[PDB]
């Protein structure tokens, strides 16, 4: 109906509507936020030892803290 | 004898058709090819981006451990 008169307008509105709506439905924006968060620009500053913390491991080989393992599995 | 120039034995046909073969295919096939190649490029670009993200995190590890 309008596809014959101004076709570049209709194509622009279609791709604009998907560029607005399409970021809602996603299994990937959570991955976007995780990858964008997990990049250390600054130095990871240590902390004073004992406020009686049964967490936060001392050797960086110890997997007690939250590591990243979804990276190497894409 | 006579030596004019008549048409000797008659001349054959001469075309005048608008003969345009209309090379190419339908436009729906053109949209299918364009969207397919575009999405192919998107997937390959996505994979290379996240590989360089992995290497960029490794370079961050270099600058962290190198600092004190």
């Amino acid at each position: 109906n309008v596809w014959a008169k101004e076709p570049v307008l209709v194509a622009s509105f279609a791709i604009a509507g998907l560029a607005v709506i399409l970021p809602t439905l996603s299994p990937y924006t959570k991955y976007s936020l995780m990858i964008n968060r997990a990049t250390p620009y600054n130095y990871p500053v240590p902390l004073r030892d004992d406020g009686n913390m049964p967490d936060v491991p001392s050797h960086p080989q110890d997997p007690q803290g939250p590591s990243l393992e979804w990276l190497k599995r894409l | 004898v006579k030596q004019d120039m008549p048409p000797v034995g008659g001349y054959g046909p001469i075309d005048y058709k608008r003969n345009l073969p209309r090379r190419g295919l339908s436009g729906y096939s053109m949209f299918a090819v364009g969207i397919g190649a575009l999405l192919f490029g998107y997937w390959s670009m996505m994979r290379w981006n996240r590989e360089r993200r992995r290497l960029q995190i490794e370079d961050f590890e270099a600058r962290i451990a190198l600092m004190p």
Side-chain angles (χ1 to χ4, degrees):
Chain A
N1 51 6
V2 71
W3 184 253
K5 291 171 71 175
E6 294 179 355
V8 63
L9 273 298
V10 181
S12 66
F13 285 121
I15 189 74
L18 70 92
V20 173
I21 294 169
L22 190 65
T24 60
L25 56 94
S26 177
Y28 292 104
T29 56
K30 60 181 290 295
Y31 291 163
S32 303
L33 190 143
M34 293 298 285
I35 302 304
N36 200 0
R37 181 176 289 173
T39 54
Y41 294 90
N42 300 321
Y43 181 75
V45 50
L47 52 92
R48 183 67 68 189
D49 46 357
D50 288 333
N52 297 116
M53 298 298 292
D55 280 325
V56 59
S58 66
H59 194 197
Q61 189 60 255
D62 194 2
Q64 291 180 355
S67 178
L68 54 92
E69 291 177 352
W70 61 93
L71 265 295
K72 193 181 285 186
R73 292 182 293 174
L74 196 282
Chain B
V1 296
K2 296 183 290 294
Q3 287 294 320
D4 289 332
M5 191 62 206
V8 179
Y11 288 163
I14 299 98
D15 55 351
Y16 61 94
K17 185 188 287 185
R18 290 184 65 188
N19 192 0
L20 298 176
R22 294 180 66 251
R23 184 260 177 88
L25 293 174
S26 177
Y28 182 77
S29 65
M30 188 67 204
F31 283 109
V33 169
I35 296 300
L38 181 271
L39 188 62
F40 176 75
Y42 279 170
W43 182 69
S44 182
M45 192 67 204
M46 175 267 178
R47 194 264 300 163
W48 179 253
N49 279 122
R50 295 184 72 244
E51 288 185 354
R52 197 180 170 187
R53 294 300 302 276
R54 295 178 182 176
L55 298 175
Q56 206 282 127
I57 296 168
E58 288 184 352
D59 295 332
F60 275 169
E61 289 182 348
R63 62 87 50 86
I64 287 170
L66 197 61
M67 193 181 76

